[PDB]
Design an enzyme around this catalytic site. Structure first.
Site, PDB file in Angstrom:
ATOM      1  N   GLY A  99       0.794  -1.227   0.000  1.00  0.00           N
ATOM      2  CA  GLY A  99       0.000   0.000   0.000  1.00  0.00           C
ATOM      3  C   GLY A  99       0.826   1.275   0.000  1.00  0.00           C
ATOM      4  O   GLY A  99       0.415   2.284  -0.577  1.00  0.00           O
ATOM      5  N   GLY A 132       4.404   1.146  -0.681  1.00  0.00           N
ATOM      6  CA  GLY A 132       5.616   0.950  -1.476  1.00  0.00           C
ATOM      7  C   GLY A 132       5.834  -0.457  -1.998  1.00  0.00           C
ATOM      8  O   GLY A 132       4.877  -1.185  -2.274  1.00  0.00           O
ATOM      9  N   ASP A 146      -7.749  -5.049  10.936  1.00  0.00           N
ATOM     10  CA  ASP A 146      -7.619  -5.539   9.560  1.00  0.00           C
ATOM     11  C   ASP A 146      -7.393  -7.057   9.489  1.00  0.00           C
ATOM     12  O   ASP A 146      -6.704  -7.556   8.593  1.00  0.00           O
ATOM     13  CB  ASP A 146      -6.528  -4.780   8.785  1.00  0.00           C
ATOM     14  CG  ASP A 146      -6.722  -4.845   7.275  1.00  0.00           C
ATOM     15  OD1 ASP A 146      -7.866  -5.059   6.818  1.00  0.00           O
ATOM     16  OD2 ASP A 146      -5.726  -4.680   6.541  1.00  0.00           O
TER      17      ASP A 146
HETATM   18  N1  LIG Z   1       6.677 -11.318   5.605  1.00  0.00           N
HETATM   19  C1  LIG Z   1       6.405 -11.730   4.371  1.00  0.00           C
HETATM   20  N2  LIG Z   1       6.723 -12.976   3.984  1.00  0.00           N
HETATM   21  C2  LIG Z   1       6.453 -13.397   2.754  1.00  0.00           C
HETATM   22  N3  LIG Z   1       5.868 -12.610   1.862  1.00  0.00           N
HETATM   23  C3  LIG Z   1       5.524 -11.350   2.183  1.00  0.00           C
HETATM   24  C4  LIG Z   1       5.790 -10.879   3.459  1.00  0.00           C
HETATM   25  N4  LIG Z   1       5.358  -9.626   3.520  1.00  0.00           N
HETATM   26  C5  LIG Z   1       4.844  -9.312   2.333  1.00  0.00           C
HETATM   27  N5  LIG Z   1       4.938 -10.360   1.512  1.00  0.00           N
HETATM   28  C6  LIG Z   1       4.473 -10.404   0.094  1.00  0.00           C
HETATM   29  O1  LIG Z   1       4.343  -9.045  -0.421  1.00  0.00           O
HETATM   30  C7  LIG Z   1       2.996  -8.871  -0.930  1.00  0.00           C
HETATM   31  C8  LIG Z   1       2.596  -7.392  -0.720  1.00  0.00           C
HETATM   32  O2  LIG Z   1       1.468  -7.230   0.155  1.00  0.00           O
HETATM   33  P1  LIG Z   1       1.649  -6.623   1.644  1.00  0.00           P
HETATM   34  O3  LIG Z   1       2.243  -7.671   2.499  1.00  0.00           O
HETATM   35  O4  LIG Z   1       2.309  -5.302   1.545  1.00  0.00           O
HETATM   36  O5  LIG Z   1       0.117  -6.431   2.096  1.00  0.00           O
HETATM   37  P2  LIG Z   1      -0.749  -5.191   1.557  1.00  0.00           P
HETATM   38  O6  LIG Z   1      -0.285  -3.969   2.249  1.00  0.00           O
HETATM   39  O7  LIG Z   1      -0.753  -5.237   0.079  1.00  0.00           O
HETATM   40  C9  LIG Z   1      -2.396  -5.618   2.168  1.00  0.00           C
HETATM   41  P3  LIG Z   1      -3.613  -4.384   1.639  1.00  0.00           P
HETATM   42  O8  LIG Z   1      -2.834  -3.230   0.806  1.00  0.00           O
HETATM   43  O9  LIG Z   1      -4.736  -4.963   0.860  1.00  0.00           O
HETATM   44  O10 LIG Z   1      -4.128  -3.647   2.987  1.00  0.00           O
HETATM   45  C10 LIG Z   1       2.147  -9.864  -0.137  1.00  0.00           C
HETATM   46  O11 LIG Z   1       0.995 -10.234  -0.902  1.00  0.00           O
HETATM   47  C11 LIG Z   1       3.085 -11.052   0.018  1.00  0.00           C
HETATM   48  O12 LIG Z   1       3.012 -11.901  -1.135  1.00  0.00           O
HETATM   49 MG   LIG Z   2      -3.626  -3.506   7.153  1.00  0.00          MG
END
Ligand SMILES: Nc1ncnc2c1ncn2[C@@H]1O[C@H](COP(=O)(O)OP(=O)(O)CP(=O)(O)O)[C@@H](O)[C@H]1O
Ligand SMILES: [Mg+2]
Length: 278
Positions: free
Chosen positions: A22, A24, A140
């Site tokens: 969201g 970066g 969330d």
């Molecule tokens: N600790 C972790 N271990 C493995 N993969 C991870 C990770 N953190 C993030 N990822 C990967 O990076 C992707 C980016 O999504 P993120 O983890 O930032 O959630 P998000 O902020 O997109 C949820 P939303 O924006 O819908 O509120 C995730 O879908 C996952 O595949």
């Molecule tokens: Mg969240």
């Protein structure tokens, strides 16, 4: 908020970009000290964005830092530390994706014993959160925000709670409207400035319990306009239908956890005890 370690660019090895968040980018990396696989979340507010969205991105990033700095539990995604230029979070890499995408594989259902492992692991995570002083309100909790360490029934950890923005930790009650109404408590979604507590997460956990049990999205069996949908959840006690074959002890936990009255939603010591008996 406790002390958070700082890591220079020398202490990490970038491997690949694994996702887009969201605020970066998300990269896969390695910690040069102990070869630990990590997830690096960068804060990038591009000059294409507006004033109100840019300040929401910064406060989102920082809340995640502030809350996670105190957290230390096997069922919560761990923060190894912080980076600068750009501001980055170094997280533990959770190798088997998220619960949401796994449940979409209808051809390969998760077996009952692993489903129970997932239910308990998440409950333990939230139990730890509600046992904090003050209690942590996630705000969330949903299947995309539950990361899977392993789907093996005999693993030390199967599921981990992730994504702690929009999260709050205050001695006074919190407020504010929440978007994803299919996952969120009625006292949070009614287009107003209503007060609520950590019991809103207990409601979200009931939906997580439903989605694991059925493999289906909560409220997917219904189709209503947004206003009507919220009103049904709030005033008519609309809930996803628990299948007839559900173990009576699990059905009670779900039903109590998504009660309209938040006071009737159980303490997690009861939730953990009941789930372990399944
Ligand atoms: N600790 C972790 N271990 C493995 N993969 C991870 C990770 N953190 C993030 N990822 C990967 O990076 C992707 C980016 O999504 P993120 O983890 O930032 O959630 P998000 O902020 O997109 C949820 P939303 O924006 O819908 O509120 C995730 O879908 C996952 O595949
Ligand atoms: Mg969240």
């Amino acid at each position: 908020k406790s002390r958070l370690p700082t890591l220079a660019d020398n202490e990490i090895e970038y491997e690949k970009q694994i996702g887009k968040g969201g605020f970066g980018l998300v990269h896969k990396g390695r910690l040069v000290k102990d070869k630990s696989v990590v997830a690096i979340k960068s804060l990038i507010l591009g000059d294409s964005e507006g004033e109100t969205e840019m300040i929401e991105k910064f406060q989102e990033f920082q809340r995640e830092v502030f809350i996670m700095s105190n957290l230390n539990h096997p069922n919560i995604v761990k923060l190894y530390g912080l980076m600068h230029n750009p501001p980055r979070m170094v997280m533990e890499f959770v190798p088997c994706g998220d619960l949401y995408h796994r449940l979409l594989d209808k051809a390969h259902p998760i077996k009952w014993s692993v489903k129970l492992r997932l239910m308990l692991d998440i409950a333990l995570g939230i139990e730890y959160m509600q046992n904090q002083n003050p209690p942590i309100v996630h705000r969330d909790l949903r299947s995309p925000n539950i990361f899977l360490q392993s789907l093996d029934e005999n693993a030390p950890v199967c599921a981990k709670v992730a994504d702690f923005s929009l999260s709050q930790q205050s001695v006074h009650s919190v407020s504010g409207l929440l978007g994803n109404f299919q996952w969120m408590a009625p006292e949070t979604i009614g287009a107003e400035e209503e007060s609520y507590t950590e019991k809103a997460d207990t409601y979200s956990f009931a939906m997580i319990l439903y989605t694991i049990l059925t493999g289906e999205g909560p409220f997917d069996e219904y189709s209503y306009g947004k206003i009507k949908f919220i009103n049904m959840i709030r005033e008519e006690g609309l809930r996803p239908t628990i299948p007839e074959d559900c173990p009576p002890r699990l059905r009670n936990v779900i039903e109590l956890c998504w009660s309209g009255d938040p006071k009737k939603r159980p303490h997690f010591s009861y939730i953990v005890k009941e789930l372990s008996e399944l």
